[PDB]
């Protein structure tokens, strides 16, 4: 699949602006809660992305009616 | 006046778990400024969701072979 | 607050190609049914947005070390 | 690259209303095409949510004044 080095390389290739995360993956358990923290995190960010895009539309709608 | 009741209510009608945006909307200058930091957040939160999705993908197959 | 004209300018200003919605609004109920249809369409579309983004990242992931 | 099984378990996990897309990835081209399809849909979608978010702001403002 990919080791921690190949993983870090695929990370930089995709997100050339971000530093690869340094997770502890010593056991299967480590992987699962790490996978849990991500899942919960994706939900926190997708909502935030939706709250900002909502700010966006409302804001561009405003300067338009004052443009 | 330049009052929001529908935006406010709409905000709560989507995300009943956050603070009502506090934007220094007075000026055209303030609207622009705010529209600009909203787009800065979006492009940022969007890449972080992708980074998380990448991490989830990676952690999921790591889990795979080790379970 | 804005009304017909202005609403159209705001729509054309953000969506150059799409024609402004020609919604039949004659009473409160019409506003509530449209609003209801809009909240359901937003959640649905956002669902697909997240599904397609996941496809994308995954696909471009394979283009990484493969 | 972080491959199979791992992808779906991320799909079913992150999204449930959905059975995963059984894409065709037998070469670099199938992947690029699908990638192309994805980007294209993401673009149309964001345009659609935005328009819906716009009408929701309108509708919510209309409501609040005659209801």
Curated annotation (Swiss-Prot), chains A, B, D:
Function: Protein with a unique structure having two opposing regulatory activities toward small GTP-binding proteins. The C-terminus is a GTPase-activating protein (GAP) domain which stimulates GTP hydrolysis by RAC1, RAC2 and CDC42. Accelerates the intrinsic rate of GTP hydrolysis of RAC1 or CDC42, leading to down-regulation of the active GTP-bound form. The central Dbl homology (DH) domain functions as guanine nucleotide exchange factor (GEF) that modulates the GTPases CDC42, RHOA and RAC1. Promotes the conversion of CDC42, RHOA and RAC1 from the GDP-bound to the GTP-bound form.
Full-sequence range covered: 1 to 67 of 1271
Listed name of the protein: Breakpoint cluster region protein
Residues carrying N-acetylmethionine: 1
Maturation and modification: Autophosphorylated. Phosphorylated by FES/FPS on tyrosine residues, leading to down-regulation of the BCR kinase activity.
Disease linked to the protein: Leukemia, chronic myeloid: A clonal myeloproliferative disorder of a pluripotent stem cell with a specific cytogenetic abnormality, the Philadelphia chromosome (Ph), involving myeloid, erythroid, megakaryocytic, B-lymphoid, and sometimes T-lymphoid cells, but not marrow fibroblasts. A chromosomal aberration involving BCR has been found in patients with chronic myeloid leukemia. Translocation t(9;22)(q34;q11) with ABL1. The translocation produces a BCR-ABL found also in acute myeloid leukemia (AML) and acute lymphoblastic leukemia (ALL).
Taxonomic placement: Eukaryota, Metazoa, Chordata, Craniata, Vertebrata
Subunit structure: Homotetramer. Interacts with PDZK1. May interact with CCPG1. Interacts with FES/FPS, ABL1, PIK3R1 and GRB2. Interacts with HCK. Interacts with SH2D5. Interacts with DLG4.
Compartments where found: Postsynaptic density; Cell projection, Dendritic spine; Cell projection, Axon; Synapse
Domain-related comment: The region involved in binding to ABL1 SH2-domain is rich in serine residues and needs to be Ser/Thr phosphorylated prior to SH2 binding. This region is essential for the activation of the ABL1 tyrosine kinase and transforming potential of the chimeric BCR-ABL oncogene. The DH domain is involved in interaction with CCPG1.
UniProt source species: Homo sapiens (Human)
Coiled coil (UniProt feature): 28-55
């Amino acid at each position: 699949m990919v080791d921690p080095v190949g993983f870090a390389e695929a990370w930089k290739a995709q997100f050339p602006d971000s530093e690869p995360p340094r997770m502890e993956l010593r056991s299967v358990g480590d992987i699962e809660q790490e996978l849990e923290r991500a899942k919960a995190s994706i939900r926190r960010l997708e909502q935030e992305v939706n709250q900002e895009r909502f700010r966006m539309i409302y804001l561009q709608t405003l300067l338009a009616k004052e443009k």
